[PDB]
Amino acid sequence: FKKPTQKFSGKIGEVEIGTGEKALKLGGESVLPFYTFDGDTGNTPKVGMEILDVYPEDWIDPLKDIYKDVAKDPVKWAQFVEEKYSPDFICLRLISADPNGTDAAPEDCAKTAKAVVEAIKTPLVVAGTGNHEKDAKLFEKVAQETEGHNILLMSAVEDNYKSVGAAGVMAYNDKVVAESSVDINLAKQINILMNQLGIDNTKFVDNVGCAAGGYGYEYVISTLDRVKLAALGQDDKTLQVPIISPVSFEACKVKEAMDSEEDSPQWGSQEDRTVSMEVATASGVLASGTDAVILRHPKSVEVIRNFIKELLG
Amino acid sequence: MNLFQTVFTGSKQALAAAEGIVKQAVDEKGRDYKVAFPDTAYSLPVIFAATGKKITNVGELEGALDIVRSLIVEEEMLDKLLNSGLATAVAAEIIEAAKYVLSDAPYAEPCVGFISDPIIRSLGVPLVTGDIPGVAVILGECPDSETAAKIIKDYQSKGLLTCLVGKVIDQAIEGKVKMGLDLRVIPLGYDVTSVIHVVTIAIRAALIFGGIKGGQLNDILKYTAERVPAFVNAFGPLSELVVSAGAGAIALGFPVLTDQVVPEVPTLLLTQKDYDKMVKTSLEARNIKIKITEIPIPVSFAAAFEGERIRKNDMLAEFGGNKTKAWELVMCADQGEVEDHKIEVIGPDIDTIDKAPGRMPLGMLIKVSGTNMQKDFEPVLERRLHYFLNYIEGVMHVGQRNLTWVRIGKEAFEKGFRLKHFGEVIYAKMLDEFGSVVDKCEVTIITDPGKAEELEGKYAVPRYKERDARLESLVDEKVDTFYSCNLCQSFAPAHVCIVTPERLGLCGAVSWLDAKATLELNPTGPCQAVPKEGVVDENLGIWEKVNETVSKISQGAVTSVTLYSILQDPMTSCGCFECITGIMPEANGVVMVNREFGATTPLGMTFGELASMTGGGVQTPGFMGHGRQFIASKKFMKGEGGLGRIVWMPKELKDFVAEKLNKTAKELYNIDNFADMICDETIATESEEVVKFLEEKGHPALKMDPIM
Amino acid sequence: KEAILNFKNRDQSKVMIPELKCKAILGYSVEEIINKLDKVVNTQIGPMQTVKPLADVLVSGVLRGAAAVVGCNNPKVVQDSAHIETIKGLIKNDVIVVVTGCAAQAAAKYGLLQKEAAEKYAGPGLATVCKLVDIPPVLHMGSCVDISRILDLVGRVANLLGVDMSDLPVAGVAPEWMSEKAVAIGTYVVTSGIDTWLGVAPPVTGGPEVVDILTNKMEDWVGAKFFIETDPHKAVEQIVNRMNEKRKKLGI
Ligand code: SF4
Ligand code: NI
Ligand code: NI
């Protein structure tokens, strides 16, 4: 037989997040994920851990047992996570600014983000709520306060793409996440809008959507496949940015993960089901072409790191 | 002294003042003394922008005078005038830099002097998002304090950041204008050279937000001209230095407005004596648009109030239908014939109603003017009217053109709804949704029985007839640009729709004019332009540019397409189509199936099996999906002979299309009643029966060349 | 019908059509020019439908002047050479050019009647004006009788500025004229107060008094005079110098 050696004319761009020796690079691959036989994968996929500013009341009991003594303080929580598990990056989700739930002024969340970012050396990803109107002001304040650390701002959706673009990349030299929803054409549109604003492909990453396994997962898989094939096979310049997928945002809120053993006695250990859901979702999206994943349970982080190490090496 | 000589004289005076103050700095501080601006990373921004050099000591400040000298070439050509304006800007910066060298704090409050980099980053985000519509650079002196206060507070109330130079700072204080960075009223200084402090804001905006390295002067000037919405209002007598500084503002693309008689340059240097119109003149000159945040109406306006039908019990007023005559029209007119935010009502209002549900004619006339507005965009906006009225609770609008059908509830009458609020809502939504192509909007509500009919006859019906004529007479030959749509790629990844005047979007809702309007109004959207280049086969419908665009958009899945043929490199289908055309070789023709037709066809497969075989963005020769309007097209199966191949069709589809199908067949080569020769499910649904009927009916498809 | 029936007598073996065609834009009547100028009029200032924007660009010095290039070909001059060289020199010197007749057709063949020509040949002021108004640097105003339009245009400008037509920085050029119509045109253009350059010497060199009248004394009568110059580059230089002289007289 003849070895299959189809070549690609495209290459995913590289985006650097963080400062110092902990700074991580995303992108650079010229082939499909883990296709070390086809060519070179520019950077290894990065795994990050998720923390909240407020106490995680809705998380499962094992996770609240893991962070029983640090979950009150975001700074202590971030320092504990960094000292114990040493992730590639930390995602600080500002859920206290969610208008539907408890509502907070952008100044308080910006102060919390600054306190967290001035206590850790690992790259920090600041994620807002789902509200675009709140997100614009929140990210303006956060980027003003957390200046000089090259943080990543998530969910710069089209409705506020200018504001998060202006307060982020342009003003305070941060990175941004252009977010679309299970569509390759919408990802192209948001990338083109960011490029026309004056923001290069080296200044933002993409979020083509994320879902838990079993809940619209095939749409995410197909979108990842399509954007990867277009960026590499077609040399589509507007899709050549790295992709970040927040897995624990959706995979940890499903019935299979969040049902206690007393709620479903036949299913078994709640912690095992949570870790299994996280690992399955992250593994699938990593295989489909994501560059960074955000995980909640440290066991999931360890399993995914070993998975990446086994596949790449 | 002409304009060029005035600017050259001003630049020389600016150079003379720069040399004198630099000499003082050398004599008092020495050439080793540090030169800097408070809290900036760009050194002296204008010199850094123009040359890329950072100036740190007094000796280099003295060496920066050569930049001013090299920028003053006294030749009466436009480029030299702009360079001389930049010479004044560099000289003004050197003067301001020497001020900080000579005196530790050269500006006393209210003047702020230099604007630090953190402030620029603070106001940079509102500049990008449009929260700051523009920068009003006001310098000089107004005839009185109240005139200055009125203009300044007019800019402030519109969200613009206004900067003040000269005696207008004192006049505004006498006029009690609240000055502050959060109040967007920044006094820079009483000297003309203080205007450089807002110039460096635009310069550093290019450096910080545009990412342009120092020394790339042309890129920086291009950036400030396109990205920074700044303009100059020069009040009071203007010296040569002021005019030369204005040439610097013009060099950055900022138009200069003044109340003085000057050698006007269109779009760049304008005289406006009327202080009551200076703000509006400047906004037009700088293309600044202010977003009306709220619609000044008492009744609630929201999208959630669409489709809430109010019954006879709730209803107060009723327009159109069989009760009376009502019409709506959106027409493009020259800017002189439209007046911005002019809402007028002709005739009685709904307040004169007897409180019983009453009938009265309603004529709605919306004149829109703009630079990018054309006649083909008139229907599109008009359709949105249907939604704009429906988002108001208490009123409902259905119908189009002279078939307008509107109901207004009694609760709207209680809350305070009148006919002027129709115009207010229409104007607000026209300027919001269609701000790209609509600059000025005038709404007129007519209630008189005579005036409504007179305006409908004069304006409405001629435009309806011309729109119908344009829709009828457009063919692929006249145009030189088709349009590609990829909206249905969310479920058909390889599907690309090519829309021509004769080939509609196969969903049935996207036309050539609709695609053009979408491309104009929504760039980077579903609809993009496809030039008609590299024609290969006009009978078949092959263009090299069309193949290139299809290959690009489909991400390489489909490489070559044919617009007019069903068997050779056909177009793909997504799944929104209502009709499917399939080939029947025994009849030497093609059969047609519709979505509502659930029974079988001569071909065998039903619509569902045909839909599964045809849709999904796969090129399947011999089958295609399309709408009801493409059937009677001149280009329908032009590559295989024409629509004479149509041999079978459901009776409902045939009855719907018969008129235009007969017209096109009469033009083709056939007797007008071509519908009767086409078989249907009533006569026969079977191979041999259909073939027998066709051959006994003299169908033209049996006399053509073999279809395959 | 006679022409169409003659197609049957075509000998296709004798046919040779060079594949050389050029896109051109024309139709610039005074009304069309005014309509184009309306774009650069601020609505809050006005007025509309006047030559005022053109008068403004001329007075401010963004445009140095306006020149009419008219006339025929003549075997005495390399065909179309003088037309093209004169037009390119004028537009390079920020002189807006209006063309009529065979000169206009030479400009059309060469490719000057294009919007793109503004960025390829025009100087900075004229390039800016062309971009702002969306016009070519060379405006085709029609046939030889349509030179009257040029007069009309100039007259309007003069009437807007309250001066005679001899006070404006305007000129006419006939680089390659041959016809008696061209002689009459140049004579009435000079008599109207517009200096005229002739690229072909008229048969007057034998009469010293006539040469002196046409090139020197005419300026005392009507404020304009003939210039005889067979070198197009020198003609462009002389036109620019004369326009600058009239600008300095007018104070602009
Ligand atoms: S079928 Fe209609 S909506 Fe779908 S891609 Fe074609 S034109 Fe767009
Ligand atoms: Ni479709
Ligand atoms: Ni479809």
Side-chain angles (χ1 to χ4, degrees), chain B residues 420-490:
Chain B
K420 60 188 66 176
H421 304 100
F422 269 114
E424 298 287 63
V425 169
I426 290 177
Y427 170 86
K429 291 303 297 177
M430 285 273 116
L431 264 298
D432 171 284
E433 180 137 46
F434 304 99
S436 179
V437 305
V438 181
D439 283 333
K440 306 165 62 182
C441 176
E442 155 190 330
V443 189
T444 306
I445 303 286
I446 305 96
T447 326
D448 318 60
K451 279 257 72 180
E453 194 64 8
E454 190 266 344
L455 291 184
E456 182 190 16
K458 190 213 304 295
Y459 288 132
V461 312
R463 290 189 182 272
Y464 302 153
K465 297 316 114 188
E466 80 187 1
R467 289 166 187 173
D468 300 327
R470 172 155 184 77
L471 278 170
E472 209 79 30
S473 66
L474 247 191
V475 293
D476 296 0
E477 293 82 332
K478 303 310 174 183
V479 305
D480 63 338
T481 293
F482 299 146
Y483 291 97
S484 61
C485 185
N486 59 16
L487 191 59
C488 292
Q489 287 196 347
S490 54

Side-chain angles (χ1 to χ4, degrees), chain B residues 98 182 227 304 314 324 344 426 517 536 597 602 621 626 671:
Chain B
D182 54 328
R227 302 288 222 177
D314 197 12
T324 181
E344 90 166 0
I426 290 177
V536 180
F597 183 83
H626 55 77
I671 42 89

Side-chain angles (χ1 to χ4, degrees), chain A residues 55-279:
Chain A
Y55 186 84
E57 222 80 61
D58 44 322
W59 290 11
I60 65 174
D61 308 71
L63 279 171
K64 292 187 290 186
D65 280 324
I66 290 182
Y67 309 116
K68 62 177 172 61
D69 56 327
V70 296
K72 307 294 183 179
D73 187 13
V75 182
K76 277 186 58 61
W77 196 354
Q79 290 183 329
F80 169 86
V81 161
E82 194 185 23
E83 183 178 2
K84 196 159 193 315
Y85 313 114
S86 174
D88 298 83
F89 58 93
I90 296 184
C91 177
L92 171 59
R93 189 137 67 103
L94 307 174
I95 83 165
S96 61
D98 174 52
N100 195 85
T102 168
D103 197 3
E107 292 76 0
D108 298 61
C109 301
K111 179 180 64 179
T112 299
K114 179 182 180 300
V116 171
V117 82
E118 302 214 10
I120 59 178
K121 309 300 169 297
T122 177
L124 184 68
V125 177
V126 181
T129 176
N131 207 36
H132 316 330
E133 308 278 343
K134 191 71 178 64
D135 271 17
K137 317 299 179 301
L138 188 71
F139 285 142
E140 195 191 356
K141 277 300 301 174
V142 166
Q144 185 207 151
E145 291 277 306
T146 75
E147 180 182 4
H149 303 273
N150 192 25
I151 71 167
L152 184 71
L153 301 168
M154 286 199 89
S155 291
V157 305
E158 182 179 352
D159 278 318
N160 53 15
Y161 91 92
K162 293 183 180 299
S163 180
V164 198
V169 173
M170 283 183 165
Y172 302 102
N173 280 262
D174 295 328
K175 302 296 180 294
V176 176
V177 183
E179 208 266 328
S180 68
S181 208
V182 298
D183 225 281
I184 174 183
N185 294 320
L186 294 182
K188 285 175 58 62
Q189 162 152 48
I190 189 62
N191 290 10
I192 292 176
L193 287 179
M194 297 291 291
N195 271 327
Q196 291 174 354
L197 193 55
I199 299 170
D200 311 73
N201 278 10
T202 65
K203 295 281 174 283
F204 66 94
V205 303
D206 266 13
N207 185 12
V208 304
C210 194
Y215 307 87
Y217 197 60
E218 71 273 29
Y219 303 105
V220 182
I221 298 305
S222 291
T223 303
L224 281 169
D225 288 333
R226 284 213 271 168
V227 298
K228 265 297 184 298
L229 290 177
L232 296 177
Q234 310 300 132
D235 198 359
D236 200 324
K237 302 290 180 179
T238 64
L239 287 173
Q240 286 176 354
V241 293
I243 302 173
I244 183 172
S245 296
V247 166
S248 66
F249 292 12
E250 329 281 346
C252 293
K253 76 202 314 170
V254 301
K255 174 181 175 58
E256 289 78 356
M258 270 214 176
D259 267 8
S260 64
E261 190 168 7
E262 309 82 33
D263 208 316
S264 292
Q266 74 284 10
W267 277 358
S269 181
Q270 184 185 23
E271 184 178 24
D272 289 346
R273 284 182 283 107
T274 295
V275 173
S276 188
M277 284 290 309
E278 260 185 303
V279 164

Side-chain angles (χ1 to χ4, degrees), chain B residues 164-311:
Chain B
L164 295 317
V165 178
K167 301 306 297 176
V168 286
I169 299 170
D170 298 335
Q171 287 181 325
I173 291 176
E174 301 172 30
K176 300 167 182 56
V177 175
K178 305 307 163 192
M179 301 184 181
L181 177 63
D182 54 328
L183 297 162
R184 294 178 178 177
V185 180
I186 296 177
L188 300 178
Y190 297 102
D191 291 65
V192 180
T193 59
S194 297
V195 76
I196 202 62
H197 294 307
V198 63
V199 173
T200 58
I201 296 175
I203 293 296
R204 279 171 289 169
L207 299 173
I208 297 176
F209 312 110
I212 303 179
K213 300 302 177 182
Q216 306 305 302
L217 181 59
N218 279 22
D219 287 64
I220 296 167
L221 297 180
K222 163 187 55 51
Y223 185 95
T224 55
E226 273 89 303
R227 302 288 222 177
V228 183
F231 60 87
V232 175
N233 288 345
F235 296 111
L238 305 182
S239 65
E240 293 107 37
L241 176 56
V242 176
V243 176
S244 65
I250 298 176
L252 267 70
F254 303 153
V256 175
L257 296 292
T258 185
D259 62 352
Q260 305 293 302
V261 179
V262 298
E264 280 183 299
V265 179
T267 78
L268 298 181
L269 183 58
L270 307 173
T271 291
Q272 176 58 265
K273 262 86 68 175
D274 192 357
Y275 299 92
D276 288 331
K277 296 193 305 179
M278 176 56 81
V279 169
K280 282 63 62 188
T281 312
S282 302
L283 302 179
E284 178 182 346
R286 203 34 179 161
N287 291 321
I288 294 177
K289 300 177 180 58
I290 277 77
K291 321 309 300 169
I292 303 301
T293 73
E294 56 87 18
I295 310 181
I297 57 172
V299 193
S300 171
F301 181 89
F305 302 108
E306 205 291 315
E308 41 187 44
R309 343 286 293 191
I310 58 199
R311 271 307 103 188

Side-chain angles (χ1 to χ4, degrees), chain B residues 33 64 117 292 573 696-697:
Chain B
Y33 190 86
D117 269 328
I292 303 301
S573 305
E696 86 174 40
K697 210 66 187 62

